[PDB]
């Protein structure tokens, strides 16, 4: 209990002269509590259960009726040198490596690229399972974005972001905020469950770090009662995730034109909402307005550093997205 009391120092999180005892629930108003986050763990499991049903009785018949092959990817032709290079050298050879392999094996570069793509597909799961997972993600993201838009349409701090900090932290918790935060955290914990235990042959990369950062931000902004700006960030980030899954579903259905159009639109929305609106609208209120309304307290630095890390990760993702979308634009012409 000593270590927990040291971690939850009231002079670190809350502003000056504000104590946790002032945020206790009474009959006058209710405030967010850390214990309310425990409920995110059972519901997450329930969500996972529902996901299985969605992949069993709903997404699978739709994929079958879409002429999606239920078997595994086509087996790449055997090659000792190619297999050794793939296992040891790299999985995505560069132009120089491809030229060297072509010269060594007296084979066309296109054949080597096709073999590498086939090997990568063989390592990756089957197409139908990915289609079902993308369908589930698309449904959830569409519902969450719609709910977030409907909820923020009436809130007073959407139009004037300074209302996020005027009465902070003495801002009562409503049912809509609680439901929104619990739903988001439950979905992220469901993703963590599907990543850790469902199949441990998956990859821990940048996406895993981004998920960890998102979970940390949601948890410690709900605990600290920074939910008004959290909802803005959540809606802004979930705006562009409803088109990526649709583009993936179109790609897995062998619809070239539809997938290209959907991905171009997704890239436009992603760039607009995570490089032009985020730093001028969300990073404005959490850096400048918060400084002049609330004041400098230690948790401000931590949260702003995490937001800058999120901005950097979004820059990296946007770079990859535009690099891929240039090929789609070229093909569309």
């Amino acid at each position: 209990a000593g270590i927990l009391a040291w971690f939850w120092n009231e002079r670190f999180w809350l502003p000056h002269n504000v104590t946790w005892a002032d945020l206790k629930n009474t009959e006058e108003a209710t405030f967010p509590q850390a214990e309310d986050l425990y409920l995110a763990f059972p519901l997450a499991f329930c969500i996972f259960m529902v996901r299985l049903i969605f992949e069993r009785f709903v997404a699978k018949p739709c994929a079958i009726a879409l002429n999606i092959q239920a078997n595994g990817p086509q087996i790449a032709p055997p090659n000792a040198i190619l297999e050794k290079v793939f296992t040891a050298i790299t999985k995505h050879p560069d132009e120089k490596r491809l030229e060297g392999l072509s010269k060594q094996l007296d084979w066309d570069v296109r054949s080597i690229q096709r073999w590498f793509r086939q090997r990568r597909n063989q390592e990756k799961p089957s197409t139908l399972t990915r289609f079902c997972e993308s369908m589930w993600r698309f449904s959830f993201y569409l519902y969450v974005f719609t709910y977030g838009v409907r909820f923020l349409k009436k809130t007073p701090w959407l139009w004037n972001t300074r209302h996020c900090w005027y009465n902070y932290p003495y801002q009562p918790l409503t049912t809509d905020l609680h439901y929104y935060y619990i739903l988001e955290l439950s979905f992220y914990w469901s993703l963590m469950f599907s990543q850790f235990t469902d199949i441990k042959r998956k990859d821990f990369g940048i996406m895993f770090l981004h998920h960890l950062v998102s979970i940390f931000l949601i948890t410690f902004s709900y605990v600290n009662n920074m939910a008004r700006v959290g909802t803005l960030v959540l809606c802004l980030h979930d705006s562009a995730d409803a088109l990526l899954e649709a583009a993936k579903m179109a790609n897995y259905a062998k619809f070239q034109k539809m997938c290209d159009l959907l991905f171009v639109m997704f890239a436009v929305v992603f760039i607009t909402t995570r490089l032009g609106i985020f730093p001028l609208w969300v990073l404005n209120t959490t850096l400048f307005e918060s400084w002049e309304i609330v004041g400098p307290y230690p948790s401000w630095w931590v949260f702003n550093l995490l937001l800058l890390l999120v901005q950097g990760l979004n820059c990296f993702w946007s770079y990859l997205i535009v690099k891929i979308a240039c090929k789609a634009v070229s093909r569309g012409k």
Partner: nanobody, 124 residues
Framework: QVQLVESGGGLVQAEGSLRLSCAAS????????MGWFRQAPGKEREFVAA????????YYADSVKGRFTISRDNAKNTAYLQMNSLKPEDTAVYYC???????????????????WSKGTPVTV
């Protein structure tokens, strides 16, 4: 959930200066935003000034802006309103109130302030 008592009222000369005080009997005065209201003969109550719990943000009314300054001291659990260059239109009864934990900042309505006070008469 605070009891507010006002002081500093009285008669003042034209273009004078006055300083109303509103003291709170409680330890929760620092978690509520203070505000002041005016009651002139006839008409109805009018909004004068208000501020949030920390005192960083402060907003007045259009007719009184530039002359009245409202601040607060959480150490002494009190709020102050300094009025400079008074006018005959300022002769009225002043009431001290607090935001009711659910009214948003910038409210200028009677229903948004709960803990009222007796008020003090000011004549110019």
């Amino acid at each position: 959930q605070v009891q507010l008592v006002e002081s500093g009222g009285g008669l003042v000369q034209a273009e004078g200066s006055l300083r109303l005080s509103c003291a709170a009997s409680g330890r929760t005065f620092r978690t509520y935003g203070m505000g002041w209201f005016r009651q002139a003969p006839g008409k109805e109550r009018e909004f004068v000034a208000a501020l949030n719990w920390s005192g960083s943000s402060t907003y007045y009314a259009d007719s009184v802006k530039g002359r009245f300054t409202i601040s607060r001291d959480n150490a002494k659990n009190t709020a102050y309103l300094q009025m400079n260059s008074l006018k005959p239109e300022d002769t009225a009864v002043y009431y001290c109130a607090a935001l009711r934990r659910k009214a948003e900042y910038g409210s200028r309505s009677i229903a948004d302030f709960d803990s009222w006070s007796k008020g003090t008469p000011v004549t110019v």
